[PDB]
Ligand binder design. Sequence first.
Ligand SMILES: [Mg+2]
Ligand SMILES: [Mg+2]
Ligand SMILES: [Mg+2]
Ligand SMILES: [Mg+2]
Ligand SMILES: [Mg+2]
Lengths: 283, 283, 283, 283
Amino acid sequence: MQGFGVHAMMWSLNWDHESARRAIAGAADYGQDFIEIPLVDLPSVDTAHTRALLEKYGLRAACSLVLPEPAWASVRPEAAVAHLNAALDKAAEMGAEALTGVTYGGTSERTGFPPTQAEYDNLTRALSQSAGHAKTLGLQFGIEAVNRYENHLVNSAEQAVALVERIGADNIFVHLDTFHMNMEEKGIANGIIAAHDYLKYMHMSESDRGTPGFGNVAWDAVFAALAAIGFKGVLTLESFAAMPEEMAGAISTWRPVASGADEVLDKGLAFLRDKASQYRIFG
Amino acid sequence: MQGFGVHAMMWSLNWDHESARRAIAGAADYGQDFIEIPLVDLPSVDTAHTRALLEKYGLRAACSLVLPEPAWASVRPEAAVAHLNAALDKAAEMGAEALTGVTYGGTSERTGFPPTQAEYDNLTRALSQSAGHAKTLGLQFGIEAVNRYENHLVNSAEQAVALVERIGADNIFVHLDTFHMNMEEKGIANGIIAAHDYLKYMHMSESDRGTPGFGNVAWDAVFAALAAIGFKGVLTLESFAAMPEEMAGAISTWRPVASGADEVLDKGLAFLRDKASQYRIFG
Amino acid sequence: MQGFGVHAMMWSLNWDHESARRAIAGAADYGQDFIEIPLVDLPSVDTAHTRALLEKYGLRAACSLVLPEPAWASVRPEAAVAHLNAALDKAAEMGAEALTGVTYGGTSERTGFPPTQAEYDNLTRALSQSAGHAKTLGLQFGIEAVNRYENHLVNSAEQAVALVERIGADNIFVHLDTFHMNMEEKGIANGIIAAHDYLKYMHMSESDRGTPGFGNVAWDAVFAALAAIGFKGVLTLESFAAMPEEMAGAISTWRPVASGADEVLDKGLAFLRDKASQYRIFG
Amino acid sequence: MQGFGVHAMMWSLNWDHESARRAIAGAADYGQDFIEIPLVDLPSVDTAHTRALLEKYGLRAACSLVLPEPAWASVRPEAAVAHLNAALDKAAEMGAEALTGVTYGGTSERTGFPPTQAEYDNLTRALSQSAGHAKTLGLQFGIEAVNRYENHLVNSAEQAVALVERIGADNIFVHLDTFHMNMEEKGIANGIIAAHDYLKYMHMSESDRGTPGFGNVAWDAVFAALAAIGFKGVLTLESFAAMPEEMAGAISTWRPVASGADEVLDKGLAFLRDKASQYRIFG
Ligand SMILES: [Mg+2]
Ligand SMILES: [Mg+2]
Ligand SMILES: [Mg+2]
Ligand SMILES: [Mg+2]
Ligand SMILES: [Mg+2]
């Protein structure tokens, strides 16, 4: 998996038939190599229709998700293995090449206490079996580290690496998010250096979830480190600029993040492509 | 109020006789002008004792708090005023010069929706009552903007500024926190510039609540902005280095933030002092 | 004198009838407010022609120069005055509103020693009289600080400020250059802050003379300081991407600075615009 | 060679008996692994005295120089070889482990033209010769890139690496300077990344030659790239704070650079120590 990507939420929150087409056509109009397709309601996604659309527009894809609370692997690992295996099935039917995201828990998961060894044991056994199922399907399996307000289990790149190393599956990769690294990494580039050869997917996201290039992420440090470790994964723009006010509660966003999704695709995709070139990413 | 401050959390977050002695003498060993005292249990504070220790060490003080849920001003403004007024009576007894912090709601407050006009009506009237009560005691009243995960009402400097102008008191100041601006401000210095008329207090906190100078906050942009608007207030360090594991739920940190408090105090107060000199912060 | 500007060197430094139209038409095409016209060989300037082009394309102009060695003001102030007064004449005929740049010495000036009392007295007397000649014409007069390898007299913003105060003329402004500031200012924002009373003109130039936004200049600090001091003048793009190799010696530049002037124009101009909008530079 | 170093110029540029003592005791007092010994006037450097001091204080050493004009290698390669070999003889006698710096030319060298093939031909043969002499003495040989105003031949790390690869000698390393990279590298970390195969020595110097951490150098990007390429080498502090006013012409510095070598050693070495530990520079 290598090239530039855009998250489908730049257009669509749902994945009905038309939403799928509008997002896929848009990502192709912006010359992306990948679209990242969110899986929120597994019954509702038509895998054959999505595969046809991708073929029409010469686009590749990865899927992402967040485990629903009944499937949180830290307490209910068997429900997680079922839900992730189900997700991997529809990913592989779609033509996607990986499932990534918060594949290990929730984005409002707290126990109130530091993460325990019994929790990390459930995670290890849950992710071990599903990545296995991913391997039988030829898919890769990602783990996105997120900030301490969303999850208590995987916050820093170091914790994601330690999880991957314990499972021992060569088809699991570490997935980092510049919005979350901005809070969690002691110097954002240190997240990328810790991940090193496990790092195969990035969410390139401004510090306010707006337009990359216009916030607090130290993009030179980020691209310095991706270049120095020889990064050859996917760089996917993640922004909240097209989120309606209804989505507020699910994403903890209470006021507009940018002027509009048009501005974010125009300027944010070109910024990521021009920084990639300055630092000879994929060179 | 002008000068350098350190939050008492660097030595404890209880405020019994012993914790007060340890924190106040600690802040004096480090040549601070101010200590920031958190008011967590109003019936338990020995205000007279604190006052005598402050005079003994020649230390000045600000008080800060977070409103408990029964008193969140957005939904229960009468309860907010009764609590804020009692906290102000304690601050004045100790000899503090201001009450600041999350004085309008909680740090775990959500409605699931963006802030509505009736919630701001409630905030405006509750803070205008209590700012008046603070005025009768000779104290100033502060509003600290925090990030979207802790609160949905006052996130950006502009919001804080617009709320001050609505209340129309002359003893209310805006209070910014670089850890929170690192998420909420579209370029951190834009927060300081927006508040140029009302900014009188800063929390100088690193992007991970660790040691200032060793994270992702753009300190040169922060200090340039403080210098250019002619900042005339307090620069208080805030870090979670002294926080034991048992506090993890109340602060949502599940990983140590630094080596030890002694290191944060040593390295962080020196960094802030050196950046202050470089940018001529107090003349 | 307010808005965005591009230096004519983006097209060519020659200013015959062909070069002026191309440069002025090019500057209009990119929506600029000002073009900076270099005055090099004075007798080859048709100024009525240039004034016609300007008012046809709706463009304003400032003129810039460097003193040639026999007119260096530190040692030959009378020759400085006559040369400056002659540049001011043709600048006025063109309808430019200001003459700026290294109006006080050379870009290869060096005595081997720190600048002396007597050298500054020569500068003062020379610029004092030429600034008065500019006043009768309606022109403003600028002093551009440059780095220690090009000049030994005006390197820092505070030097420029002290010189302007010394001269006592109300029509001289400080001109600063982000490329030179990157070497001379102890934290680039401190030059902008120090000049805050007299700063009316900027050279927005990347650290390698390439494309602004793709080097080592800390643009968030630059723009934060501009906004916070309430900057009102012109922001002019300076870059060497159009210079042929025969210019190498004249600009101490031994390798290409970028991959073409069209790229620097398209990407660099839009970067200065988006940054200005982010920090709300012009309201 | 591996560890932290400091330039003897922080104490003196003369290397007589008491300056050698002053500087070596001084470096040892700040816990340095290395001291960099300038070689300027060869017949006055006592080698037995210097070697004895180094072993008493547990200090290792590198020597450095600039070629005097009669021996610039680009135009007089036989003369360069003589001067380099004699300097190498002194360095070996002192106990030093390498000769580095501007070993291919001068710091006010310029033809007025971009560098030519024939010039690089002379460098290649002269450096080939003397690096083989250095090999006979058990020394490595360094080449330091400097900025376009000091030298027209070796400005970017890329040029350094190409030269090193042409000569083909297993004891030549690349040596970079953050002060010079801040001008020459399009994004400062790109130079470190370009040299990843041959980078074994850094001058850690602020953008104004003052105190590292209080200027314009992007230290997070610098230390990140160093970490990510797995740097094993020397991080040597370089600053002009201790240099008398009579030395202005040699270093093109016309005004004070910081506030004294004392503050520069104290705060700068502290800043490099803390940055080095943040990014885990040596494991
Ligand atoms: Mg993400
Ligand atoms: Mg009233
Ligand atoms: Mg705070
Ligand atoms: Mg300029
Ligand atoms: Mg050097």
